[PDB]
Write a protein that binds this DNA or RNA. Structure first.
Ligand SMILES: [Zn+2]
Lengths: 25, 136, 101, 213, 67
RNA sequence: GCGCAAGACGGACCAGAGCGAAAGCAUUUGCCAAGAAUGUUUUCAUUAAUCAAGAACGAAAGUCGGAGGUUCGAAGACGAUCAGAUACCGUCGUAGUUCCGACCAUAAACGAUGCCGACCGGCGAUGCGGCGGCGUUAUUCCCAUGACCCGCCGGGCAGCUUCCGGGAAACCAAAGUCUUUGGGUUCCGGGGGGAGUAUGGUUGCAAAGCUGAAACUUAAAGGAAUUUGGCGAAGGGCACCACC
């Protein structure tokens, strides 16, 4: 895949990971 | 309809508006003021296929019909006013406009001044479509 | 690699220019990049001029002309056969194409 | 369905006395039945005629808009409504490698006639000029606009509508502007492209009678 | 329709190059006998020469290139 | 065809033209403030160049609060296309697009070429300021001015040619003056992936910005150019094993 949509996908994955960590308090 | 004027020396003047686009043609005839129309035909009522609404033959048939109606109603001289779709869309007139002009010439009608009334803007409004246009 | 001396445009001391729209397409293209064609056309082309001139009210009537400037995107200009591809030595030639009449 | 064109009446339109050819043409309107009067539909009509069809042997790229204001029977008496140029001449005068000047005023005559004159002025390539540019600096453009403003205001303010429209049949305003704007930058193509109407006074029929001789 | 067109009769003056997608029609420059000064261009189908008399069901339609 | 109301925008003039540190800037007029370059036999006399910390500005998209919403139009509702089409196409349309007030500091923010200074070829043009000169014009004489013609100087955006020279080459009058290696100075890279990733700090209402690894895995990933390769690339010709 091209770099732009890969960076968007990794942004979405990082947002999901941050949400899961902030809900795993 | 009929007038008391002589049919030998003087001629009766009207204007005719040829609004032609890439899809359809209009051959409209009004009086000198333009407020009172006479008879309006389009290439959509000369052929029973809307694909051929922009054909030269439909415009030719419409021009012959409107010229016969104006001849039998009492109009013998016309001023040409050509027009495209105007706006920001395009400025080149439709492909049946000069065909309708020639068919108006063949039917026995006098032609006077020829002008164009395309509504050209001073960068009014953005066109329909995206930044990349229509990709076809 | 770098293909042209300029970058396919004429922007040398600006950084930003006004974008225009294509005629056939609606693509937003900068003004100094789009290929322009100021064509002067007449109302009746080659055979209807005698048709108007013989059947007319005014004698010695000059036929009016239509003036229009066309803005073309690069893909639309190549697709509409306005410009073509040229060789590596003939790419650096900025003269207009020759005209016969 | 009855024939709609059998209940029409053919009328006439008459140019004012400051032109040569009084006859313009014929219009049509329905007859007088009901609450609607046939003379009402002849009120708000604008007739657009070229200058060569109205004067005798003059230019043809100028048009005059004429509006009927009063009717006396079987003819419609017209009045001035504006002046405009043709589109092909306006597109032909605009060319590259020369700068472009516009100017406009809000002038009023000796009566209630607020005009809005528009005019253009184009720079001239000299006969022995080698340079292709022939541009002008911005302050020369400002002085040319000031001279155009002064000439347009000075020529209409002291006259009524009849004299200034009599001056509009030739391009004497254009000749005065081209004579004035010569020590700044030489101009060659000066025309009055458009004249509008803003305010109409109270309808007086007598002035319309001296306007037709 | 409600208006019959008279069958105009015409005679060719010069033949141009071959047109059409598969080369099945050719360009001609043709003139009329009732009006000798009038000339018009048309697409004809079949083998033609210079000087032959050819029939037209209409005298208003123009010619066309390969499309 | 004639009038009204609202919002947006400023065509053709518009150019390998101008200005600004950059992002950027195009209707007319009025007001305020700033600036480059040119001119000078003015004035101070080393006040200079590049710069961690710190500070200003910064496209569009994005968020919060208002007035306003013409057109275009993310999400969405459809109609065709298709094996599928929640895509290309067409009809509507929500946030947004426009202004005010508060925020983030991101782009292929690119001449993909830091700033200051010196030297090293030629030519014709172009924008600004100044100097000189036959002539034409603002109607016939004189002077200054504007508009042309011919040259010169200084700064700037650029062009053509070159066995100066350099480079892996494309190319470059700088990317030259570099093994005959040193003018001053700031930032920055050591094969590819993991990876602008995890954690820590910090900034922001939020979206997110700045700083920024390692384990592991691989012998390649790359840059320039020439002939047969295929183009649903273009320009010319040919074939009844192609067509009409
Ligand atoms: Zn396009």
């Amino acid at each position: 895949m091209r770099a732009k949509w890969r960076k968007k996908r990794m942004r979405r994955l990082k947002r999901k990971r941050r949400k899961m960590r902030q809900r795993s308090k | 309809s009929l007038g008391p004027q002589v049919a030998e020396g003087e001629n009766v003047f009207g204007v005719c508006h040829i609004f032609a686009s890439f899809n359809d043609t209009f051959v409209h005839v009004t009086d000198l003021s333009g407020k009172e129309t006479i008879c309006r035909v389009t290439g959509g009522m000369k052929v029973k296929a809307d694909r051929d609404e922009s054909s030269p033959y439909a415009a030719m048939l419409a021009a012959q019909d409107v010229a016969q109606r104006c001849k039998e109603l009492g109009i013998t001289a016309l001023h040409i006013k050509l027009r495209a779709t105007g706006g920001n869309r395009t400025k080149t007139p439709g492909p049946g406009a000069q065909s309708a002009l020639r068919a108006l010439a063949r039917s026995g009608m006098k032609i006077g001044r020829i002008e164009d009334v395309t509504p050209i803007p001073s960068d009014s409004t953005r066109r329909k479509g995206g930044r990349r246009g229509r990709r076809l | 690699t770098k293909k042209r001396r300029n970058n396919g445009r004429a922007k040398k001391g600006r950084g930003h220019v006004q974008p225009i729209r294509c005629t056939n397409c609606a693509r937003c293209v900068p003004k100094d990049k789009a290929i322009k064609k100021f064509v002067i056309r007449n109302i009746v082309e080659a055979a209807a001029v005698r048709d108007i001139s013989e059947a007319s009210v005014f004698d010695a009537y000059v036929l009016p002309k239509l003036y229009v400037k066309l803005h073309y995107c690069v893909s639309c200009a190549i697709h509409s056969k306005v410009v073509r591809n040229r060789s590596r030595e003939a790419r650096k030639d900025r003269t207009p194409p020759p005209r016969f009449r | 369905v009855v024939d709609p064109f059998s209940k029409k009446d053919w009328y006439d339109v008459k140019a004012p006395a400051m032109f040569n050819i009084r006859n313009i043409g014929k219009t049509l309107v329905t007859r007088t039945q009901g609450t609607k009067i046939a003379s009402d539909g002849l009120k708000g009509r604008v007739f657009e005629v070229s200058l060569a069809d109205l004067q005798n042997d003059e230019v043809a790229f100028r048009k005059f808009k004429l509006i009927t204001e009063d009717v006396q029977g079987k003819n419609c008496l017209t009045n001035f409504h504006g002046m405009d140029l043709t589109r092909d001449k306006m597109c032909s005068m605009v060319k590259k490698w020369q700068t472009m000047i516009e100017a406009h005023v809000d002038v009023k005559t000796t009566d209630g006639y607020l005009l809005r004159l528009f005019c253009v002025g184009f720079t001239k390539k000299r006969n022995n000029q080698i340079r292709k540019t022939s541009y002008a600096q911005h302050q020369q453009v400002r002085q040319i606009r000031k001279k155009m403003m002064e000439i347009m205001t000075r020529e209409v303010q002291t006259n009524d509508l009849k004299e200034v429209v009599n001056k509009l049949i030739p391009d004497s305003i254009g000749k005065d502007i081209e004579k004035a704007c010569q020590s700044i930058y030489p101009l060659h193509d000066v025309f009055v492209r458009k004249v509008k109407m803003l305010k109409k006074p109270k309808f007086e029929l007598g002035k319309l009678m001296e306007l037709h001789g | 329709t409600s208006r019959v067109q008279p069958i105009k009769l015409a005679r060719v003056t010069k033949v141009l190059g071959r047109t059409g997608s598969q080369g099945q029609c050719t360009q001609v420059r043709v003139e009329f006998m009732d009006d000798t000064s009038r000339s018009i261009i048309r697409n004809v189908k079949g083998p033609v020469r210079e000087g032959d008399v050819l029939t037209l069901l209409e005298s208003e339609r123009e010619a066309r290139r390969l499309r």
